[PDB]
Amino acid sequence: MVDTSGVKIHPAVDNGIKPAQPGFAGGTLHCKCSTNPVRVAVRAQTAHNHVCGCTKCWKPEGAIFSQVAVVGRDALEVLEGAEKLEIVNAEAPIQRHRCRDCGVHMYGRIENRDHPFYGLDFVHTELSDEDGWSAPEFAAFVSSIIESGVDPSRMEAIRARLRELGLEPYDALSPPLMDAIATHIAKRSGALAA
Amino acid sequence: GHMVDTSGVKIHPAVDNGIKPAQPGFAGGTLHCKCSTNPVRVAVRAQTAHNHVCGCTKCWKPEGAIFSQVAVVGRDALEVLEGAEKLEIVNAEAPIQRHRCRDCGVHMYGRIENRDHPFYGLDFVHTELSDEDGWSAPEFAAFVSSIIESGVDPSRMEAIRARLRELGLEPYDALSPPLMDAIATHIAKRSGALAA
Ligand SMILES: [Zn+2]
Ligand SMILES: [Zn+2]
Ligand SMILES: [Zn+2]
Ligand SMILES: [Zn+2]
Known part of the structure:
Protein backbone atom coordinates (compact mmCIF):
# COMPACT_ATOMS: atom_id res chain seq x y z
CA MET A 1 0.00 0.00 0.00
CA VAL A 2 2.38 2.70 1.31
CA ASP A 3 5.68 3.54 -0.35
CA THR A 4 8.60 3.26 2.07
CA SER A 5 11.60 3.73 -0.29
CA GLY A 6 14.15 6.41 0.58
CA VAL A 7 12.77 6.97 4.13
CA LYS A 8 15.64 7.52 6.55
CA ILE A 9 15.10 7.24 10.34
CA HIS A 10 18.59 7.16 11.96
CA PRO A 11 21.72 5.56 10.33
CA ALA A 12 21.93 2.91 13.11
CA VAL A 13 18.60 1.47 11.91
CA ASP A 14 18.41 2.32 8.22
CA ASN A 15 19.83 -1.14 7.22
CA GLY A 16 17.85 -2.88 9.94
CA ILE A 17 18.25 -3.25 13.63
CA LYS A 18 21.52 -4.74 15.08
CA PRO A 19 20.99 -7.46 17.76
CA ALA A 20 22.35 -7.21 21.30
CA GLN A 21 25.15 -9.54 22.30
CA PRO A 22 24.26 -11.91 25.16
CA GLY A 23 26.61 -11.22 28.07
CA PHE A 24 27.52 -7.71 26.85
CA ALA A 25 29.38 -6.01 29.67
CA GLY A 26 29.46 -2.44 28.40
CA GLY A 27 31.93 -0.27 26.54
CA THR A 28 33.12 3.27 25.82
CA LEU A 29 31.39 6.32 24.39
CA HIS A 30 33.47 9.00 22.56
CA CYS A 31 32.53 12.42 21.27
CA LYS A 32 33.25 13.37 17.68
CA CYS A 33 36.39 15.55 18.20
CA SER A 34 39.51 14.50 16.26
CA THR A 35 41.57 15.29 19.37
CA ASN A 36 41.09 15.30 23.21
CA PRO A 37 37.67 13.59 22.80
CA VAL A 38 35.25 13.22 25.71
CA ARG A 39 35.38 9.49 26.65
CA VAL A 40 32.65 7.88 28.84
CA ALA A 41 32.80 4.33 30.24
CA VAL A 42 29.44 2.57 30.22
CA ARG A 43 30.07 -0.43 32.49
CA ALA A 44 26.76 -2.28 31.99
CA GLN A 45 24.37 -3.32 29.23
CA THR A 46 21.85 -0.59 28.31
CA ALA A 47 18.05 -0.91 28.45
CA HIS A 48 15.23 0.53 26.39
CA ASN A 49 17.20 1.63 23.38
CA HIS A 50 14.78 3.33 21.02
CA VAL A 51 14.69 5.90 18.25
CA CYS A 52 13.32 9.20 19.52
CA GLY A 53 11.59 12.00 17.63
CA CYS A 54 11.65 14.76 20.25
CA THR A 55 13.48 18.02 19.46
CA LYS A 56 15.64 17.90 22.62
CA CYS A 57 17.96 14.99 22.02
CA TRP A 58 21.18 14.64 19.96
CA LYS A 59 20.84 13.31 16.36
CA PRO A 60 23.72 12.63 14.00
CA GLU A 61 24.02 14.85 10.89
CA GLY A 62 20.93 14.53 8.63
CA ALA A 63 19.03 12.19 10.99
CA ILE A 64 15.31 12.70 11.71
CA PHE A 65 15.31 10.51 14.85
CA SER A 66 17.85 10.15 17.59
CA GLN A 67 18.73 6.74 19.11
CA VAL A 68 18.90 6.76 22.84
CA ALA A 69 19.04 4.15 25.63
CA VAL A 70 19.20 4.09 29.34
CA VAL A 71 21.85 2.73 31.74
CA GLY A 72 21.99 2.67 35.53
CA ARG A 73 23.93 5.77 36.51
CA ASP A 74 26.57 3.88 38.66
CA ALA A 75 27.68 2.24 35.37
CA LEU A 76 28.71 5.57 33.86
CA GLU A 77 32.13 7.30 34.37
CA VAL A 78 33.71 10.13 32.42
CA LEU A 79 37.16 8.80 31.57
CA GLU A 80 38.79 11.71 29.69
CA GLY A 81 37.58 15.22 29.02
CA ALA A 82 35.13 16.30 31.75
CA GLU A 83 36.29 19.98 31.55
CA LYS A 84 35.01 19.95 27.91
CA LEU A 85 31.42 19.12 28.94
CA GLU A 86 28.66 21.65 29.33
CA ILE A 87 24.96 21.30 30.30
CA VAL A 88 22.68 22.15 27.26
CA ASN A 89 19.92 23.42 29.61
CA ALA A 90 20.27 23.39 33.40
CA GLU A 91 16.49 23.91 33.69
CA ALA A 92 15.63 20.77 31.71
CA PRO A 93 14.37 17.89 34.00
CA ILE A 94 16.80 15.59 32.10
CA GLN A 95 20.13 17.55 31.98
CA ARG A 96 22.06 17.00 28.78
CA HIS A 97 25.86 17.00 29.05
CA ARG A 98 27.22 18.05 25.72
CA CYS A 99 30.76 18.43 24.48
CA ARG A 100 31.76 22.10 24.09
CA ASP A 101 33.47 21.61 20.66
CA CYS A 102 31.46 19.15 18.53
CA GLY A 103 28.06 19.44 20.28
CA VAL A 104 27.67 15.74 21.04
CA HIS A 105 25.57 14.77 24.09
CA MET A 106 27.63 12.34 26.06
CA TYR A 107 24.92 11.61 28.61
CA GLY A 108 21.73 12.99 30.22
CA ARG A 109 21.40 13.07 33.98
CA ILE A 110 18.35 13.31 36.20
CA GLU A 111 19.35 15.21 39.33
CA ASN A 112 15.75 15.22 40.71
CA ARG A 113 15.50 12.34 43.24
CA ASP A 114 11.69 12.23 42.68
CA HIS A 115 11.74 12.10 38.85
CA PRO A 116 10.59 8.68 37.47
CA PHE A 117 13.87 8.17 35.56
CA TYR A 118 16.09 9.00 38.50
CA GLY A 119 18.98 6.57 38.88
CA LEU A 120 19.28 6.16 35.13
CA ASP A 121 21.45 7.97 32.62
CA PHE A 122 20.56 8.53 29.00
CA PRO A 136 16.30 -0.35 19.61
CA GLU A 137 12.87 -1.57 20.75
CA PHE A 138 10.40 1.15 19.55
CA ALA A 139 9.99 4.71 18.15
CA ALA A 140 9.08 7.46 20.63
CA PHE A 141 7.74 10.99 20.16
CA VAL A 142 7.17 10.33 16.48
CA SER A 143 4.77 13.18 15.81
CA SER A 144 7.41 15.65 17.22
CA ILE A 145 9.64 15.24 14.21
CA ILE A 146 7.18 17.64 12.60
CA GLU A 147 8.39 20.30 15.05
CA SER A 148 11.84 20.04 13.49
CA GLY A 149 10.60 20.61 9.97
CA VAL A 150 9.45 17.22 8.72
CA ASP A 151 6.43 17.75 6.46
CA PRO A 152 3.22 16.23 7.92
CA SER A 153 2.44 14.48 4.58
CA ARG A 154 5.66 12.49 5.17
CA MET A 155 4.28 10.93 8.36
CA GLU A 156 2.46 7.99 6.82
CA ALA A 157 5.62 6.73 5.13
CA ILE A 158 7.81 7.35 8.16
CA ARG A 159 5.47 5.28 10.42
CA ALA A 160 5.14 2.60 7.74
CA ARG A 161 8.96 2.36 7.58
CA LEU A 162 9.25 2.30 11.36
CA ARG A 163 6.85 -0.64 11.49
CA GLU A 164 8.73 -2.55 8.81
CA LEU A 165 11.98 -2.09 10.77
CA GLY A 166 10.04 -3.57 13.74
CA LEU A 167 9.97 -0.29 15.69
CA GLU A 168 6.44 0.45 16.84
CA PRO A 169 5.70 4.25 16.48
CA TYR A 170 4.42 6.07 19.54
CA ASP A 171 3.69 9.77 20.07
CA ALA A 172 5.01 9.37 23.59
CA LEU A 173 7.05 6.48 25.06
CA SER A 174 6.10 2.79 24.67
CA PRO A 175 3.09 1.68 26.73
CA PRO A 176 5.22 -0.26 29.38
CA LEU A 177 7.38 2.81 29.89
CA MET A 178 4.34 5.13 30.16
CA ASP A 179 2.69 2.79 32.77
CA ALA A 180 6.07 2.82 34.65
CA ILE A 181 6.03 6.64 34.67
CA ALA A 182 2.31 6.86 35.74
CA THR A 183 2.97 4.27 38.57
CA HIS A 184 5.83 6.34 39.85
CA ILE A 185 3.65 9.50 39.76
CA ALA A 186 0.71 7.69 41.35
CA LYS A 187 2.89 6.23 44.20
CA ARG A 188 4.27 9.72 44.89
CA SER A 189 0.81 11.27 44.96
CA GLY A 190 -0.98 8.71 47.07
CA ALA A 191 -3.27 7.50 44.25
CA LEU A 192 -1.63 4.08 44.67
CA ALA A 193 -0.47 2.19 47.77
CA ALA A 194 3.39 2.56 48.54
CA GLY B 1 -11.73 -17.29 20.62
CA HIS B 2 -9.47 -14.74 22.37
CA MET B 3 -5.95 -14.06 23.86
CA VAL B 4 -6.43 -11.72 26.86
CA ASP B 5 -9.26 -12.05 29.36
CA THR B 6 -11.29 -8.93 29.26
CA SER B 7 -14.25 -9.96 31.45
CA GLY B 8 -15.26 -7.54 34.19
CA VAL B 9 -13.40 -4.57 32.50
CA LYS B 10 -15.56 -1.44 32.72
CA ILE B 11 -14.40 1.66 30.72
CA HIS B 12 -17.30 4.19 30.63
CA PRO B 13 -21.13 3.39 30.85
CA ALA B 14 -21.52 4.96 27.38
CA VAL B 15 -19.22 2.26 25.81
CA ASP B 16 -19.69 -0.66 28.25
CA ASN B 17 -23.08 -1.80 27.02
CA GLY B 18 -23.26 -0.72 23.42
CA ILE B 19 -21.89 2.34 21.66
CA LYS B 20 -24.69 4.48 20.23
CA PRO B 21 -23.88 5.66 16.72
CA ALA B 22 -24.03 9.14 15.12
CA GLN B 23 -27.41 9.73 13.32
CA PRO B 24 -27.61 11.65 10.07
CA GLY B 25 -27.85 15.46 10.02
CA PHE B 26 -27.65 15.50 13.83
CA ALA B 27 -27.67 19.15 14.69
CA GLY B 28 -26.96 19.16 18.41
CA GLY B 29 -28.81 19.33 21.69
CA THR B 30 -28.60 20.29 25.39
CA LEU B 31 -26.22 19.15 28.12
CA HIS B 32 -27.60 19.14 31.63
CA CYS B 33 -25.68 18.76 34.94
CA LYS B 34 -26.80 16.19 37.53
CA CYS B 35 -28.66 18.54 39.93
CA SER B 36 -32.13 17.21 40.52
CA THR B 37 -33.56 20.72 40.37
CA ASN B 38 -32.38 23.85 38.59
CA PRO B 39 -29.55 22.08 36.69
CA VAL B 40 -26.98 23.94 34.63
CA ARG B 41 -28.16 23.59 31.02
CA VAL B 42 -25.88 24.16 28.06
CA ALA B 43 -26.94 24.13 24.41
CA VAL B 44 -24.60 22.47 21.87
CA ARG B 45 -26.01 23.56 18.54
CA ALA B 46 -23.77 21.46 16.31
CA GLN B 47 -22.63 17.90 15.93
CA THR B 48 -19.38 17.19 17.78
CA ALA B 49 -16.13 15.77 16.35
CA HIS B 50 -13.30 13.66 17.79
CA ASN B 51 -15.27 12.05 20.59
CA HIS B 52 -12.96 9.71 22.39
CA VAL B 53 -12.62 8.18 25.84
CA CYS B 54 -9.76 9.67 27.86
CA GLY B 55 -7.84 8.46 30.82
CA CYS B 56 -6.33 11.75 31.99
CA THR B 57 -6.88 12.86 35.60
CA LYS B 58 -8.36 16.32 34.70
CA CYS B 59 -11.53 15.17 32.78
CA TRP B 60 -14.89 14.53 34.33
CA LYS B 61 -15.99 10.88 34.62
CA PRO B 62 -19.26 9.56 35.91
CA GLU B 63 -19.17 7.77 39.30
CA GLY B 64 -17.41 4.44 38.95
CA ALA B 65 -15.94 5.12 35.51
CA ILE B 66 -12.25 4.80 34.78
CA PHE B 67 -12.40 6.85 31.55
CA SER B 68 -14.25 10.03 30.69
CA GLN B 69 -15.91 10.48 27.31
CA VAL B 70 -15.20 13.88 25.80
CA ALA B 71 -15.82 15.49 22.39
CA VAL B 72 -14.98 18.71 20.72
CA VAL B 73 -17.23 21.42 19.23
CA GLY B 74 -16.65 24.93 17.80
CA ARG B 75 -17.01 27.43 20.66
CA ASP B 76 -19.48 29.33 18.42
CA ALA B 77 -22.03 26.55 18.89
CA LEU B 78 -21.97 26.40 22.71
CA GLU B 79 -24.20 28.46 25.01
CA VAL B 80 -24.96 28.31 28.75
CA LEU B 81 -28.73 28.46 29.10
CA GLU B 82 -29.55 28.10 32.82
CA GLY B 83 -27.27 28.13 35.89
CA ALA B 84 -24.20 30.21 34.98
CA GLU B 85 -24.01 31.11 38.73
CA LYS B 86 -23.61 27.42 39.72
CA LEU B 87 -20.53 27.08 37.52
CA GLU B 88 -16.96 27.59 38.75
CA ILE B 89 -13.63 27.20 36.83
CA VAL B 90 -11.81 24.12 38.21
CA ASN B 91 -8.29 25.50 37.51
CA ALA B 92 -8.14 28.82 35.75
CA GLU B 93 -4.46 28.12 34.97
CA ALA B 94 -5.00 24.96 32.90
CA PRO B 95 -4.89 25.32 29.07
CA ILE B 96 -8.45 23.96 29.12
CA GLN B 97 -10.59 25.79 31.68
CA ARG B 98 -13.19 23.37 32.86
CA HIS B 99 -16.46 24.81 34.07
CA ARG B 100 -18.00 22.56 36.60
CA CYS B 101 -21.26 22.77 38.49
CA ARG B 102 -20.26 23.63 42.06
CA ASP B 103 -23.18 21.46 43.30
CA CYS B 104 -23.03 18.15 41.53
CA GLY B 105 -19.41 18.27 40.34
CA VAL B 106 -20.24 17.75 36.66
CA HIS B 107 -18.13 19.67 34.13
CA MET B 108 -20.42 21.42 31.74
CA TYR B 109 -17.73 22.50 29.26
CA GLY B 110 -14.03 23.05 28.77
CA ARG B 111 -12.84 26.20 27.04
CA ILE B 112 -9.43 27.21 25.76
CA GLU B 113 -8.69 30.92 26.45
CA ASN B 114 -5.11 31.01 24.94
CA ARG B 115 -5.32 32.22 21.34
CA ASP B 116 -2.05 30.36 20.47
CA HIS B 117 -3.19 26.92 21.60
CA PRO B 118 -3.65 24.22 18.81
CA PHE B 119 -7.28 23.70 19.76
CA TYR B 120 -8.33 27.35 20.31
CA GLY B 121 -11.94 27.89 19.17
CA LEU B 122 -12.98 24.35 20.17
CA ASP B 123 -14.90 23.66 23.39
CA PHE B 124 -14.74 20.25 25.12
CA PRO B 138 -16.04 7.76 20.53
CA GLU B 139 -13.24 7.02 18.08
CA PHE B 140 -10.25 6.06 20.21
CA ALA B 141 -8.88 6.08 23.75
CA ALA B 142 -6.44 8.75 24.79
CA PHE B 143 -4.03 9.19 27.70
CA VAL B 144 -4.52 5.50 28.59
CA SER B 145 -1.57 5.04 30.99
CA SER B 146 -2.83 8.14 32.90
CA ILE B 147 -5.62 6.04 34.53
CA ILE B 148 -2.81 4.76 36.82
CA GLU B 149 -2.56 8.29 38.29
CA SER B 150 -6.24 7.96 39.43
CA GLY B 151 -5.43 4.71 41.20
CA VAL B 152 -6.00 1.88 38.72
CA ASP B 153 -3.45 -0.87 39.46
CA PRO B 154 -0.87 -1.18 36.61
CA SER B 155 -1.49 -4.96 36.61
CA ARG B 156 -4.92 -4.06 35.06
CA MET B 157 -3.46 -2.29 32.05
CA GLU B 158 -3.24 -5.26 29.66
CA ALA B 159 -6.92 -6.28 30.20
CA ILE B 160 -7.99 -2.63 29.99
CA ARG B 161 -6.09 -2.16 26.66
CA ALA B 162 -7.37 -5.38 25.21
CA ARG B 163 -10.93 -4.37 26.08
CA LEU B 164 -10.53 -0.94 24.49
CA ARG B 165 -9.34 -2.68 21.24
CA GLU B 166 -12.47 -4.96 21.39
CA LEU B 167 -14.60 -1.82 21.39
CA GLY B 168 -12.68 -0.35 18.42
CA LEU B 169 -11.14 2.30 20.64
CA GLU B 170 -7.48 2.13 19.73
CA PRO B 171 -5.56 2.95 22.95
CA TYR B 172 -2.88 5.65 22.87
CA ASP B 173 -0.95 7.10 25.75
CA ALA B 174 -1.37 10.52 24.19
CA LEU B 175 -3.99 11.59 21.61
CA SER B 176 -4.36 9.73 18.33
CA PRO B 177 -1.65 10.12 15.67
CA PRO B 178 -3.75 12.45 13.45
CA LEU B 179 -4.48 14.78 16.43
CA MET B 180 -0.87 14.49 17.52
CA ASP B 181 0.44 15.40 14.06
CA ALA B 182 -2.06 18.33 13.94
CA ILE B 183 -0.77 19.66 17.29
CA ALA B 184 2.76 19.30 16.04
CA THR B 185 1.95 21.04 12.68
CA HIS B 186 0.41 23.92 14.64
CA ILE B 187 3.55 24.21 16.88
CA ALA B 188 5.99 23.99 13.95
CA LYS B 189 4.18 26.67 11.81
CA ARG B 190 4.32 29.14 14.72
CA SER B 191 7.93 28.43 15.67
CA GLY B 192 9.36 28.95 12.21
CA ALA B 193 10.18 25.24 11.64
CA LEU B 194 7.43 24.60 9.10
CA ALA B 195 6.56 26.83 6.13
CA ALA B 196 3.79 29.49 5.75
ZN1 LIG C 1 33.80 16.79 21.32
ZN1 LIG D 1 14.38 12.67 21.85
ZN1 LIG E 1 -25.25 20.47 39.14
ZN1 LIG F 1 -9.18 13.42 29.96
Missing part, protein backbone atom coordinates in the same frame (compact mmCIF):
# COMPACT_ATOMS: atom_id res chain seq x y z
CA VAL A 123 23.22 7.55 26.50
CA HIS A 124 23.65 7.43 22.69
CA THR A 125 25.35 4.06 22.17
CA GLU A 126 26.15 4.87 18.52
CA LEU A 127 29.05 6.88 20.04
CA SER A 128 30.68 3.59 20.83
CA ASP A 129 32.82 1.64 18.35
CA GLU A 130 31.73 -1.73 19.89
CA ASP A 131 28.62 -3.59 18.74
CA GLY A 132 26.37 -5.65 21.00
CA TRP A 133 24.45 -2.92 22.77
CA SER A 134 20.81 -3.26 23.71
CA ALA A 135 18.81 -3.13 20.44
CA VAL B 125 -18.06 18.69 26.10
CA HIS B 126 -19.31 15.48 27.72
CA THR B 127 -22.19 14.59 25.33
CA GLU B 128 -23.30 11.83 27.72
CA LEU B 129 -24.85 14.77 29.57
CA SER B 130 -27.34 14.99 26.69
CA ASP B 131 -30.55 12.97 26.83
CA GLU B 132 -30.53 13.02 22.95
CA ASP B 133 -28.81 10.22 20.88
CA GLY B 134 -27.09 10.98 17.60
CA TRP B 135 -23.83 12.46 18.82
CA SER B 136 -20.54 11.53 17.26
CA ALA B 137 -19.38 8.17 18.68
